[PDB]
Amino acid sequence: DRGVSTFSPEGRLFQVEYSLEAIKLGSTAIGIATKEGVVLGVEKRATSPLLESDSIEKIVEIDRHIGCAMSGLTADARSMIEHARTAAVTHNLYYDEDINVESLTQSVCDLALRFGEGASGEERLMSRPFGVALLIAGHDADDGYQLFHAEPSGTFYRYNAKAIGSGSEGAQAELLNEWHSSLTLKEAELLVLKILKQVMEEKLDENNAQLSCITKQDGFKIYDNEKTAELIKELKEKEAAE
Amino acid sequence: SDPSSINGGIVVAMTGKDCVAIACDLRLGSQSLGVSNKFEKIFHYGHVFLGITGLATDVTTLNEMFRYKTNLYKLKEERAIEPETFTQLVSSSLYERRFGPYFVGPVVAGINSKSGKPFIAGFDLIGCIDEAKDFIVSGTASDQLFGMCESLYEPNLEPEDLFETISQALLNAADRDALSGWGAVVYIIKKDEVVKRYLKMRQD
Amino acid sequence: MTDRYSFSLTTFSPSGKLGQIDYALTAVKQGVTSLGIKATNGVVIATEKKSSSPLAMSETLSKVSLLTPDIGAVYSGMGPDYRVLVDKSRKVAHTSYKRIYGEYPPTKLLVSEVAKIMQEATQSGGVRPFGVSLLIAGHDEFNGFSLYQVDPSGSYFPWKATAIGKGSVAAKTFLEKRWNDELELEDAIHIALLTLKESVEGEFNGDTIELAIIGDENPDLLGYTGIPTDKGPRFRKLTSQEINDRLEAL
Amino acid sequence: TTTLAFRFQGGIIVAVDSRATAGNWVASQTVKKVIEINPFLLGTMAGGAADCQFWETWLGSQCRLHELREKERISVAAASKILSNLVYQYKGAGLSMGTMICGYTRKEGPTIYYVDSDGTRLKGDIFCVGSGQTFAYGVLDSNYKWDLSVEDALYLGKRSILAAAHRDAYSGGSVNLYHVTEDGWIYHGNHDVGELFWKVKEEEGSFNNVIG
Amino acid sequence: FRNNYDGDTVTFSPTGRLFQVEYALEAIKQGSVTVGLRSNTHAVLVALKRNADELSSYQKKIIKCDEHMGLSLAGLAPDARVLSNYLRQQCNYSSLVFNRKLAVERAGHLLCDKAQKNTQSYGGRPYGVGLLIIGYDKSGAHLLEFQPSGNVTELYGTAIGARSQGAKTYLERTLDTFIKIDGNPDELIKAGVEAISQSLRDESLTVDNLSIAIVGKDTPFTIYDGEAVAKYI
Amino acid sequence: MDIILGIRVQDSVILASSKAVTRGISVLKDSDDKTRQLSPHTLMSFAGEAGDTVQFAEYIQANIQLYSIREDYELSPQAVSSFVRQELAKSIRSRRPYQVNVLIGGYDKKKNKPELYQIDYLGTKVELPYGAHGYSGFYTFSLLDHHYRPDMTTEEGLDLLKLCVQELEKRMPMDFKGVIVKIVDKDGIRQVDDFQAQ
Amino acid sequence: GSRRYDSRTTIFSPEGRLYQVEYALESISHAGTAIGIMASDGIVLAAERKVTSTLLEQDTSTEKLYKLNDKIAVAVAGLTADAEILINTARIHAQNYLKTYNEDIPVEILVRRLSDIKQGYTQHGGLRPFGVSFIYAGYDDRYGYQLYTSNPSGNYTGWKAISVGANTSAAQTLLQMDYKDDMKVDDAIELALKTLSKTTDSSALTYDRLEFATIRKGANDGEVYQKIFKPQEIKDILVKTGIT
Amino acid sequence: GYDRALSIFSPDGHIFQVEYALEAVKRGTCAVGVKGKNCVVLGCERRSTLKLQDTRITPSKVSKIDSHVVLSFSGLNADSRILIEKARVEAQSHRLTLEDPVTVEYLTRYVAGVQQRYTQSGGVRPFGVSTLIAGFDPRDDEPKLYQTEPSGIYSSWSAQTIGRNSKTVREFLEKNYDRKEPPATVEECVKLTVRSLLEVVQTGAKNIEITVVKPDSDIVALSSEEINQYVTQIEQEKQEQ
């Protein structure tokens, strides 16, 4: 056949590219970073009405000051989350402090290209790249609030706002026009709630969508359904307002 | 300290006319404390008999090991193991643990099913085979057993006679050993049948 | 470096055949004929010494090998494969038996050991099956005389008489005609020589034929005396001269 | 060293001394002998400072990891067994630690677990560890009641350490108090034994044998 | 042809080529441009940072390996992290064990040898990134160009990445000029920005878009980004 | 060492174990239960080295429960004891052996008979009407050798033990803080909460 | 590299089937037929020897019936050599169990273990599976007489009567036709021979082409006894049952 | 030694070996689970490609991981055993170290992890199995029902089915299961389960087995009669119209 870490004639790694495709098929995830916190929202997208929506966990906590959202083959994200939680906790044990959001992200991205059938560079025992992208958001004293997009390629970009998943090209275009350096946390919330509604196949309600944020004061929190439902109602009103 | 003097016990085997006998006491103690008066030290796999003195846990482990090995042997060879062969299996199994040996004193007894010839053999803890024609002793009262046997023994005794001889050897030797006694059992073996008799002795 | 062939090279085809075993058997088919016959008091195995050149010294190449003092082997197929199989067999007779029980293994068990070695070359990663079929003849106290055949698959079966290789079909047929359960060793040797003649194209004498027997104990071949229970090997390769003497009464 | 921890109606009282010695040398009179695993768990340190400090801080990291993984507060039983099993892995290596793992969970209520480097893990109501333990036990055993008030309980612990600080040459410095409630532990100050002794003597009338 | 001889680095084509290696080199060309040039007192790295969206950051392209050494990358970022990390260890080793700063020429040899191993064995893949190493050691200022093929060359200046050829011709021209910008970092840096803008086309170098790094005689390898590079735009 | 006693009567096995846990100069606990239920009809008592004691007991418990789930069946007492003997006989020749002695009392539902097994840390196993570990046997065996009868009722067994515990509380130098008694029979394992004065 | 020559013995077909297992089963279907019939007072194992000659030594032969334990035996259908590899490990597992618990291994536990080993070659390792199917006839004190079957996939099931190898469809239909819960060993012995007799691809069904074994609990004893019939014994029972 | 990447990505972003693993599940006998207000019921259908089996010994479809949790599945039988064993082992280890039995979600997340892992490790193919895991968290009375698949993904359901014709039976459940009023009885819950299976089992008294799980390790499997009784009362519900 062909090696799992082979280069295409264009200078790209097949498996990594094909990986990005699976990610495109995943549920939408959006992140907005403001000077008042970072918001992270996702599309639950249950496959049947019998599936209990709240058992869908696409937004998880890394540490009190770091949380993340996922899009793609979600099962592939578990070992990534584990590695992240361990990395942040370990850092605290060694340095009696919080791990910087960038550092935590870089650690996760280090697993990324550790795949192959015997690549001469160490002992990368993992048959294929991860099939899921991650939005890592957090806060730290040196660079305040931050949003990162970690891909199976091993590269991670910092964004003021970013969307990954099925409705990303569309949603990202929206974020391009909506984002500005002075958004309030509440604005970002509605804004994320709004874009999700535009790209989601289903009609967005507090059961097929979920919000969350991370603030320096209270850290990472996942908004419960009641809290979001109200924010949803508030959006419908401001939209019908003009 | 001495793994061979913790539990106590003895075993003795003798050859007679077209027969062999193997006997042992039934004591199992923890130094001065008597713990069991039913710890038999004789086992058999087919028509081959094995007595074992020494550290009780090893006596138990070795029996379990030889059962295991003689079982597979039967399944592959499609016949029961013979005295001479088992003796070699015992030897090599013990030597395999040359630098971390089982603290035991094995004794093999039986009659070759094809030649009818009687057979007994002893081993040190690391497998050295002692193949005597007369008798073999083992245990905390082995010195006494050597004395008893050397005097009481004579060649070609009949089954009924060898029984008396081996029993008197075992009995009087055990009574001069603090760690032996509390019961005894004697096996009289012939080509066709094997009788097992429990003896009556002091219980102190 | 490092053998990275950790997967089987012999696998099942849709028809359920195991290709490499089949091909190996085909290689056996092209090999020089060899045979074995069991008598009431012995066994004989024989083959043809197909000298690959007149400059070659046929004696320096034995197709009939002693595995234990009471067991011998002969084959048909790839000579180099046979040679290593004999080395491995002689060693396994020791490591898995003599060093444990203090005596040589009985024919069926040693055969079983060889068979296992062959079966593994049929499933282990990175290898091909052995391209040979062996005929092993031996004797042991509780089983008497026996003759076995071991094929590339690792399968083995007991025979009264049989042949393998080039003219196996013809030879097997000729054997079925002359074999009975009352043959004496000499009779089997005779029948063996006749059977082998039909398979030989050119010269047929004690220098072109290789033949051994599993029979009585040869105390003269022990090398020492003093131990009553040690009487000598039962395996004995016949000499060029010994064969010719019997060819005259052909 | 003298450390104690006891269970009662209002939760758990934890009191320790703060002296560090190497032979007859007093290395410190202001050492911390209580590790704040996290806001709900406390650990006492007796024996080797490095060993206790290191593994109890590590315990903290393992508890945190548990709560992230199970989205639920770790039980005192479970936290104590993590330490216990770690320590048991090193049995024979020379670790030296006598410790009390204390917490208040909804599921268990007030819970104290004694854990030492021999691998021993014991659940109990009252525990005293250290070269001053016997002194503290004397005071504790005769005044302990399950229905003690949080105020009196705190004092009993403080007094028990005081008794030990006085008689045990390897105990003293100051007393560190802690009250453990289901909502977390509450620090109750650092009481210099020096001043505490004279004060207690006068107000209580005890320590009559000492001239003040 | 090619298709049958490009499935892995362990295969030579009928003409003696190594396609996987060549495909790797392709990843560099697709990378943002970066430039390097040195006088006799300093060495400079000017790199164009590329952004994903206008809501994204401009990926860092310069990495410090020690106080006297550093590099710029073009291609797979992860591979530069690995290679620079290895360079960091090698510099660290030289210091700890021999109390000696690692020679820039020696670093080059070490990078070449690490890259070569990934082009002769089954299973691995060549590194897909180009590197420009600058540093001041016991023999002055230095600039090196590293190619995934394992080829490392010492130069006065150069550029790698998309449209790199612009800056490269400019430098090959300005040579006699900048090679003498001794004792004046600002002049060397400006010359670097002038070479890099020779590869622009899309936009123009902005504040959060330009990245510069310098090292020399009495200047520990330091990196300037944003406001700090404003005085060069 | 602690007190580990066992007596097999007509239809049950009774195990008595001291409640004290002493660490050096002080008795840290006087309510310790030195036992683990291996299965509904099998109980194991233990005494020995500080940490090894419980770690071993719980390790054995885990394995039996796992076997019970996998096979949806309860291993016979004899089976559970051979498993335990082997575990200790392995340990005796390892880097750091388990210094634990145990008594295994179980009711064989298939044979409908109680069984008592004594196994020391070396993997020495024996089946007895009654047994003990440590010094305990020294003070009690003469009493059991005297009053023991194969047809004793559970009530008679408890009276014979009480006698043993009294002798122990008289001649033994240490205060083991009384014992916890448990009965194992056809209906399972139950604890005699009233022995502090039975 | 090597990848080029890897058959990939452990992957799924687009239909979710395991190529190798399927092909191995196909291989097994050309193997001599083996029958297993469980009665109220025993179990019967019978097998047809594939390929034979006048010169084949039958007294010293065994290619289908193997003793695993003193209470368990198996009938083989497939590659003999592969079977022997599995049989030996099965024998070792039985003894390990015995030494650990001092009780003979329950029949299902041994079967599940052997099947688990087979299942392994199905999910990892890159090796061909064993071209073997077993019929297990054994007895234990928890379920008494039991009859099991395991194939290349690693699946196993219990039966009152069953067959493996060639013409199993024909054999199964005939068995399902005349089997009765209250059968007796002697009845089953007869059913077995009749079934093989009608499914043979050979002319007649003679003794030299059969192997026979029974696991009974000899009333005059109280223990379990396995009996691997000898040439002459098969020849006899072959006449009695009316097949001469 | 063998570490070939069997589960890799294809151009369209799919992992065929995992995809084909699902196909093996579709082929397996149907399985269903529905949770009542105070229990969970697991139903499985029995094949009939061959019938002359010994039901006493032939491996049952519902397995107990611990005394309070059960696991059923659809797919390769040989594969399910590996998962069941690992799950049973992890159940004991959890009790040994946390001194508390596993929650149903925990046990599920474990099994799922093993599955996910087999989708990106060299030399191994994914599990051709999908599972339904049900039970009651220690000291809790709220019923739990989870489902896992080859990919390693898992989630909880009010009711769910897997295996052949699961498409059919799921529909039945989607228009016969009200989250507002879940089968408030062990009886009416078992009935709804039997009804859902009859949509695909086609008259199979001996082809339908049910297991009822109640709080506090109360688990029991119904007998042919008990079930057959439910079938009977159901065929009448139809005829009576």
Ligand SMILES: *C(=O)[C@]1([C@@H](O)[C@@H]2C=CCCC2)NC(=O)[C@@H]2CCO[C@@]21C
């Ligand atoms: C008490 O246990 C003690 C302390 O020094 C020590 C210090 C900090 C935390 C752990 C406890 N340990 C010792 O080894 C000395 C000598 C006697 O006891 C100490 C005072």
